[PDB]
Write a protein that binds this ligand. Structure first.
Ligand code: CLA
Ligand code: CLA
Ligand code: CLA
Ligand code: CLA
Ligand code: CLA
Ligand code: CLA
Ligand code: CLA
Ligand code: CLA
Ligand SMILES: CCCCCCCCCCCCCCCC(=O)OC[C@H](COP(=O)(O)OC[C@@H](O)CO)OC(=O)CCCCCCCCCCCCCCC
Ligand SMILES: CCCCCCCCCCCCO[C@@H]1O[C@H](CO)[C@@H](O[C@H]2O[C@H](CO)[C@@H](O)[C@H](O)[C@H]2O)[C@H](O)[C@H]1O
Ligand SMILES: CC1=C(C/C=C(\C)CCC[C@H](C)CCC[C@H](C)CCCC(C)C)C(=O)c2ccccc2C1=O
Lengths: 333, 739, 77, 39
């Protein structure tokens, strides 16, 4: 945390989450509670949208955002979005509820049983202590997180190839994908037509490449510490690593709002609704090409407009925190 | 702002078994029977019990919670009787043929004859409270829904009882919490009245309007959709009102004319039911909520913006008025009795306004054709508002005796009121003699002229006319109001001003009320009798402290008999005795108000409707020729319309015949207390005490005659108990019989 | 029924101008502009607190509701 | 609890207890045996 020259700042209650920025034990307890709250929303609102689901009406014109995500993976849908099973939606949404309860327990564990600093602990709990000064420990945290993020892309592809199989828009039938792409020259070409992908096998082979690059990226951060040039050009403080991550998650949310609005393969029109056109009034909002009954918009519009506005303010939050890291006081102006 | 004291009073039953502990002169136990009466009279006199204003305010706060628990238990009982012992499901199917009934008597000693045939095979007391019309306007369909309100009423009463124990015995607020009147007015306008009007507008839009629109369409009550089904599925709500497909977006974007199908300024009455349109009332409650929430942001609080009420009052000085309202803020934040005098004046004025608004703009379905409900709701809210107005003159006089500090009242509005008491009262004395001569003497004149066989010399519409030309012009302006001065109103505010006659069950809901010479004379009778009731009570407030007769009445108290037989006799000089005399004159005022209401409704409004459109009234238009004369009031109102209360014996209305004679007794019983006096009764009791001392059965608690104030208090209680129970039995037996 | 229009930048332009006219009214006429909870930045608000910022924007929405519905009733908007 | 016994033994509570018990006798006597003008 950048406290400038004062170095001991009372943070009151409206900015009360800056107090544990130097406290490593309470840093875990907040973040696992966020992962508990995120897994709870994935758990409760899957089952909320199962109860508010009419299988006669299409999923796009129902305000349902989680069930089309599982339907693209191949659960619960036979051929054309009619949703004939709807039990694996319940099982996946049930698993996230207990997973939220375990992460809800570990948040309350690290708040109370574990100390506010991990330097008090002895054994492996001492080795999990981190601060915003040593570069090697932050690369250790970044190394394992890239390994599980790479494993998530591989277990996406393992679901997409061996057991399960995704959903294709054209020739509407759940596939198995036995021959994905593996050529680097045809996966390098998607820097200009990433939104207009229409091959299910190319999406898997990109995720094989991403799931191997992030595992290799996580191996590189766990065997090599951060170098001198990365230490010079990047501030390693509390709300500076957050600043790079807020801008990193803002660029991801702009791409995800772009992939939701116009791609037809990863977001099929049988589940989300017809693809959108990029409009721009006072803000770049994604509008529906075809009108809908009442003021209800399709599920693809409700996802793309929410994620663009979230990626805008998480870019503004990156600009707020990076200015705080660089030394702008914000009471000067 | 929030400052409480932790456990000021312990919770124990030690003072429960020690009555009279609150008063210093009653904690010694009884010696005479006056102790028992003084125990009851001083029980709620918290300012006399406690010198500390902070502990007085803590007693008042928890007493409200106990009083609210009484009201919720009473509210739970009305909803429980509507759930378990009522034909509400029977009445909801056929409102035009089944009479409302919610009380079933036990069949013993012949009293089961009171369970009359109210239609549909149900037998019970025919209720006139209008609860069935209130519940149909609330969307009540099943008896389980009234049972759930009755259980939640008992839950709210238990929370009211818990909050009274908590805020007196556990966490009692400090005096500065009570004296923050700017925060209290902000939370009562915006949070109590504003959110209550916004919640009821939300209830009316979502529950009351879809159920009542289907009930008026002809859907059976078993086939009405449930209130949450409109909340859950908006398809049924969009079928009734297609603006709900647009959602809340026209509200937030100021496109408010989308909602004009269910938020109407329609006016008039619903022809199906005879009540107000619930599209109007939901739009009424929405507009009332916005203005009340806006008005609840007026006063200064922790965030700097707002008004200080001290700076508003001290700015409002004038050339005629000296230092103006300076010091009224210190009066109204220190004296609880001064605040109660204003609140009783305006709640009593409100309850009268409620009575005069619910007959001519009937808000409930099928209330206007229930002539018993229309007569009772006017009369009950007249009488309730009458007592509260007399209590304003009471606690105005209690403030002047007790809480009036002349040190902080120098040349302000209250000091200058005291400095021209002879100017106010004697001019109010003059206007009462003028109005009594020029309203009642008009009645005496044409009573005499009709007795002398001179109808041309009378004050009537056939003779020398006294037309209410200013009220006829105001009635004409309201008839011309839709399209000219209320252009978005499709109908008039009330059909009482003029226009359409509304028929529901072949029966007049609302009719034009034509004001003639008889309506002129009775309005000046009302102007006369209100002025005298204003005269006695303002003389009680102004001369509470002193007069030319007794200059030290402030030391004598608020509630004292007299200052002896000297100075000719100073009998009933106290501030209390003007409340005692004002209670009679409120009874005399309001009895003529409800008698004017009862006759003018039956003669000129209420009645049956011909299929061609003609109206045959109940008493056939005898107001214009007989309400100009005292004998016509005696013959064509009192004698004629009480034939239903005296021929009711052997029928379901025989309890009204019993209660008619019951109120005749207690009125006559009052005159024993009013005309006699306690020095007679003390000398009679000591002769009876001798006969008890003869048998060794003289009590240790010595028998005393009642005190002089009590003999006035018992006499005024029995007079107004007896005279009102008589009128209640007369009104209810007559109006249940007609129609 | 009085005429009302849907939302537009013309409707937003009148509302912001009604907020501006009440901000200038609140700058001139509020006796206690910084009492209680202050703003995160006292500058760019005329020294207003949280109560004065919310007080003037609420008046500018009351004037915003009154003018916009008044002009739509007359057909100006 | 001792002071609650004193409140339940006060003059208003005991006369409301007795008159309820007395009316409880008379109502229940006139429900099983009504209409007793004479013996
Ligand atoms: C990954 C997210 C991330 C992280 C970890 C931080 C971390 C920090 N921020 Mg923040 N910041 C970010 C993103 C982030 N921020 C974004 C997205 C914004 C742009 C809006 C900012 C802008 C910002 C400001 C303006 C400030 C901080 C402050 C702080 C610190 C105190 C936290 C606080 O005030 O909580 C307390 C939390 C509250 C009081 C709750 C406020 C609730 C908001 C106002 C309502 C939002 C509701 C939302 C619109 C509904 C969403 C609906 C949903 C369907 C999408 C903390 C170290 C403070 C700081 O730097 O000084 C220490 C500071 O003043 N941040
Ligand atoms: C995802 C974040 C995460 C991280 C970074 C930590 C970090 C740590 N966990 Mg852990 N934990 C978490 C979430 C996490 N946990 C959750 C989700 C739960 C499961 C409900 C717990 C419950 C838990 C237990 C019960 C214990 C740890 C302990 C530890 C320490 C490791 C010592 C050891 O033997 O290693 C392996 C260290 C502080 C131990 C410790 O020393 O805590 C004081 C220990 O007792 N954890
Ligand atoms: C109010 C908060 C909110 C809510 C409820 C959602 C809701 C949604 N987000 Mg999201 N988002 C938000 C905030 C929000 N977001 C913010 C503020 C950002 C930054 C701008 C993002 C950025 C964002 C992106 C980048 C994307 C989503 C998308 C999604 C959807 C799927 C998420 C998912 O499966 O990831 C689940 C997470 C994982 C599977 C990874 C963690 C688990 C481990 C690491 C993997 C397994 C490991 C194991 C060993 C194997 C979901 C409907 C996706 C979408 O469809 O957008 C339209 C999408 O790609 N979000
Ligand atoms: C928005 C918040 C709120 C609301 C809902 C109310 C509501 C209430 N206040 Mg209250 N008050 C408030 C905050 C609020 N106050 C604050 C901030 C102050 C301190 C400055 C006061 C000071 C205060 C005192 C001093 C007393 C009241 C009284 C009452 C009652 C008014 C008369 C009555 O019986 O109403 C009708 C009842 C209802 C509508 C039932 C409401 C059910 C719950 C309470 C909601 C009512 C229950 C008076 C009372 O009767 O005490 C109980 C009383 O004298 N209030
Ligand atoms: C305090 C009262 C109150 C409450 C709590 C409700 C509650 C509700 N209203 Mg609302 N309503 C109210 C006042 C209220 N209303 C009034 C006074 C108006 C006139 C401006 C309306 C007009 C209205 C419309 C036009 C609609 C609702 C709708 C709804 C739902 C929207 C829920 C949400 O935000 O998501 C919710 C059940 C929507 C809904 O789904 O209901 C069918 C909808 O279409 N309301
Ligand atoms: C039948 C009822 C009756 C009558 C007629 C009176 C008469 C009077 N009351 Mg009332 N009063 C009554 C019962 C009555 N009271 C009872 C029951 C109580 C006890 C609670 C009171 C207590 C009381 C109080 C507490 C007050 C009054 C006051 C008054 C006066 C009203 C104003 C006035 O002068 O009007 C004009 C006069 C009349 C309406 C009386 C009828 C006069 C007729 C119409 C004219 C007669 C012409 C005459 C005979 C011609 C002379 C010819 C010659 C041969 C005699 C008036 C003198 C108030 C007062 O003084 O206000 C100024 C007031 O302070 N009364
Ligand atoms: C550009 C400025 C402007 C314009 C030209 C209008 C124009 C209009 N206003 Mg309006 N208004 C404005 C600003 C404006 N307003 C402001 C700033 C406020 C916010 C406080 C209001 C709040 C307001 C309310 C509260 C109402 C109007 C209404 C009216 C309409 C009829 C007014 C009338 O005949 O009075 C009526 C004349 C009388 C003599 C009646 C007085 C009776 C009271 C009870 C005393 C008219 C179209 C009314 C409406 O909506 O009409 C459909 C209405 O109810 N205005
Ligand atoms: C002086 C007092 C007096 C007398 C001597 C009686 C005596 C009687 N009444 Mg009675 N009664 C009285 C006052 C009196 N009543 C009054 C004040 C009321 C009105 C509340 C009634 C109303 C009444 C009813 C309605 C009934 C009695 C009945 C009776 C009988 C009682 C039989 C019984 O319970 O054993 C007896 C003939 C019962 C009976 O058998 O009637 C003959 C019967 O049904 N009484
Ligand atoms: C018009 C009559 C009217 O009510 O004038 C009202 C007149 C107003 O006087 P001021 O201008 O002094 O009033 C300032 C007010 O704010 C009260 O303090 O007061 C009187 O003269 C009272 C006498 C009424 C007695 C008649
Ligand atoms: C510019 C300033 C004006 C100052 C105004 C001060 C008030 C003036 C009152 C004017 C009185 C109008 O005069 C009066 O009008 C009414 C209605 O219009 C007429 O009344 C007529 O209609 C009414 C219904 O409304 C009937 O009950 C009545 O029988 C009939 O005559 C009266 O016959 C006439 O006497
Ligand atoms: C009759 C009379 C009495 C005598 C009245 C007395 C002594 C009161 C008698 C009270 C009896 C004992 C009970 C009255 C009824 C109870 C209030 C009812 C209680 C409820 C029961 C069920 C217990 C006065 O003292 C008096 C004084 C001044 C002016 C007029 C009069 C007056 O007229």
């Amino acid at each position: 945390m950048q406290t400038y020259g004062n170095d001991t700042v009372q943070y009151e209650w409206w900015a009360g989450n800056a107090r544990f920025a130097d406290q490593s034990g309470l840093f875990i307890a907040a973040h696992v509670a966020q992962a508990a709250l995120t897994a709870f929303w994935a758990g409760a609102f899957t089952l909320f949208e199962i109860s508010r689901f009419d299988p006669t009406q299409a999923m796009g014109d129902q305000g349902l955002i989680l069930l089309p995500h599982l339907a693209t993976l191949g659960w619960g849908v036979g051929d054309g979005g009619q949703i004939v099973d709807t039990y694996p939606y319940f099982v996946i949404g049930s698993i996230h509820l207990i997973a939220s309860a375990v992460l809800g327990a570990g948040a309350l564990f690290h708040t109370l049983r574990a100390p506010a600093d991990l330097s008090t602990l002895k054994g492996q709990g001492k080795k999990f202590h981190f601060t915003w000064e040593n570069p090697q420990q932050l690369g250790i945290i970044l190394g394992h997180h890239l390994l599980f993020l790479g494993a998530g892309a591989l277990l996406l592809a393992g679901k997409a190839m061996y057991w399960g199989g995704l959903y294709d828009a054209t020739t509407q039938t759940v596939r198995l994908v036995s021959q994905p792409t593996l050529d680097p020259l045809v996966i390098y070409g998607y820097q200009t037509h990433f939104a207009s992908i229409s091959s299910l096998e190319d999406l898997v082979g990109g995720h094989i490449f991403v799931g191997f690059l992030l595992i290799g990226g996580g191996i590189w951060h766990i065997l090599v510490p951060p170098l001198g040039w990365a230490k010079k050009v990047l501030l390693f403080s509390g709300e500076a690593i957050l600043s790079y991550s807020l801008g990193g998650i803002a660029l991801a949310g702009f791409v995800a709002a772009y992939f939701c609005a116009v791609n037809t393969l990863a977001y099929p029109p049988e589940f989300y609704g017809p693809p959108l056109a990029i409009k721009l009034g006072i803000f770049p909002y994604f509008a529906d090409t075809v009108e809908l009954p009442m003021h209800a918009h399709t599920s693809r519009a409700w996802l793309a407009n929410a994620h663009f506005f979230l990626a805008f303010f998480f870019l503004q939050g990156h600009l707020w925190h990076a200015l705080r890291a660089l030394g702008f006081d914000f009471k000067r102006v | 702002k929030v400052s409480v004291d932790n456990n000021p009073v312990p919770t124990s039953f030690e003072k429960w078994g020690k009555p009279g502990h609150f008063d210093r002169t009653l904690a010694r136990g009884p010696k005479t029977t006056t102790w028992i009466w003084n125990l009851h009279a001083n029980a709620h006199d918290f300012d006399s019990q406690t010198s500390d204003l902070e502990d007085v305010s803590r007693k008042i706060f928890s007493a409200h919670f106990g009083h609210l628990a009484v009201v919720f238990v009473w509210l739970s009982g009305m909803y429980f009787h509507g759930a378990k012992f009522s034909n509400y499901e029977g009445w909801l199917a056929d409102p035009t043929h089944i009479k409302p009934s919610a009380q079933v008597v036990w069949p013993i000693v012949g009293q089961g004859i009171l369970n009359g045939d109210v239609g549909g095979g149900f037998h019970g007391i025919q209720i006139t409270s209008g609860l069935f019309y209130l519940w149909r306007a609330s969307g009540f369909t099943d008896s389980y829904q009234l049972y759930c309100t009755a259980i939640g009423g008992l839950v709210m009463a238990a929370l009211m009882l818990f909050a009274g124990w908590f805020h007196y015995h556990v966490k009692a607020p400090k005096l500065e919490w009570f004296q923050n009147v700017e925060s209290m007015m902000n939370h009562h306008l915006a949070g109590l009245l504003g959110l209550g009007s916004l919640g009821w507008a939300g209830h009316q839009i979502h529950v009351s309007m879809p159920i009542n629109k289907l009930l008026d369409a002809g859907v059976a009550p078993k086939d009405i959709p449930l209130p949450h089904e409109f909340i859950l599925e908006p398809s049924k709500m969009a079928e009734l009102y297609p603006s709900f497909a647009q959602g809340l977006t026209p509200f937030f974007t100021l496109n408010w004319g989308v909602y004009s199908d269910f938020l109407t300024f329609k006016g008039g009455l619903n022809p199906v039911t005879g009540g107000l349109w619930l599209s109007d009332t939901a739009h009424h409650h929405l507009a009332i909520a916005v203005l009340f929430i806006i008005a609840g942001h007026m006063y200064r609080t922790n965030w700097g913006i707002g008004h200080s009420m001290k700076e508003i009052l001290e700015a409002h000085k004038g050339p005629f008025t000296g230092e103006g309202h300076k010091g009224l803020y210190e009066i109204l934040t220190t004296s609880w009795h001064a605040q109660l005098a204003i609140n009783l004046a305006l709640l009593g004025s409100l309850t009268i306004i409620v009575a005069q608004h619910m007959y001519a703009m009937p808000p409930y379905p099928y209330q206007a054709i229930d002539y018993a409900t229309q007569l009772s709701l006017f009369t009950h809210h007249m009488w309730i508002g009458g007592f509260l107005i007399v209590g304003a003159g009471a606690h105005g006089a209690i403030f002047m005796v007790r809480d009036y500090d002349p040190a902080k009242n120098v040349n302000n509005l209250l000091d200058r009121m005291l400095r021209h008491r002879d100017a106010i009262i004697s001019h109010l004395n003059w206007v009462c003699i003028f109005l009594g001569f020029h309203s009642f003497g008009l009645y005496i004149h044409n009573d005499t002229m009709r007795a002398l066989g001179r109808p041309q010399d009378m004050f009537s519409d056939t003779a020398i006319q006294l037309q209410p030309i200013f009220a006829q012009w105001v009635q004409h302006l309201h008839t011309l109001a839709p399209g000219a001065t209320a252009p978005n109103a499709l109908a008039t505010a009330s059909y009482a001003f003029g226009g359409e006659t509304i028929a529901v069950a072949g029966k007049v809901a609302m009719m034009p009320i034509t004001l003639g010479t008889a309506d002129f004379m009775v309005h000046h009778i009302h102007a006369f009798t209100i002025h005298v009731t204003a005269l006695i009570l303002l003389k009680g407030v102004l001369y509470a402290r002193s007069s030319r007769l007794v200059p030290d009445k402030a030391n004598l108290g608020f509630r004292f008999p007299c200052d002896g037989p000297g100075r000719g006799g100073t009998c009933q000089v106290s501030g209390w005795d003007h409340v005692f005399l004002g209670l009679f004159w409120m009874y005399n005022s309001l009895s003529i108000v409800i008698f004017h209401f009862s006759w003018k409704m039956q003669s000129d409004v209420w009645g049956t409707v011909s299929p061609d459109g003609s109206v045959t009234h109940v008493t056939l238009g005898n107001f214009a020729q007989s309400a100009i004369t005292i004998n016509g009031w005696l013959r064509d109102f009192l004698w004629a319309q009480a034939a239903n209360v005296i021929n009711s014996y052997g029928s379901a209305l025989s309890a009204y015949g019993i209660m008619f004679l019951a109120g005749h007794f207690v009125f006559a019983f009052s005159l024993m207390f009013l005309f006699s006096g306690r020095g007679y009764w003390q000398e009679l009791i000591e002769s009876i005490v001798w006969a008890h001392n003869k048998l060794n059965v003289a009590p240790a608690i010595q028998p005393r005659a009642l005190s002089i104030i009590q003999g006035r208090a018992v006499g005024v209680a029995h007079y107004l108990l007896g005279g009102i129970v008589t009128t209640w039995a007369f009104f209810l037996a007559r109006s249940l019989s007609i129609g | 029924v009085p005429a009302t229009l849907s939302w537009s930048p013309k409707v937003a332009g009148v509302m912001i101008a009604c907020n501006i006219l009440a901000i200038a009214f609140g700058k001139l006429t509020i006796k206690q502009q910084n009492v209680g909870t202050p703003m995160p930045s006292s500058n760019f608000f005329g020294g207003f607190g949280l109560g004065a910022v919310l007080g003037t924007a609420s008046f500018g929405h009351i004037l915003g509701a009154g003018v916009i519905l008044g002009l739509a009733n007359m057909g100006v908007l | 609890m001792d002071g609650l016994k004193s409140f339940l033994s006060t003059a208003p509570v005991m006369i409301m207890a007795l008159l309820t018990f007395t009316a409880g006798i008379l109502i229940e006597f006139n429900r099983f045996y009504p209409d007793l003008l004479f013996h």
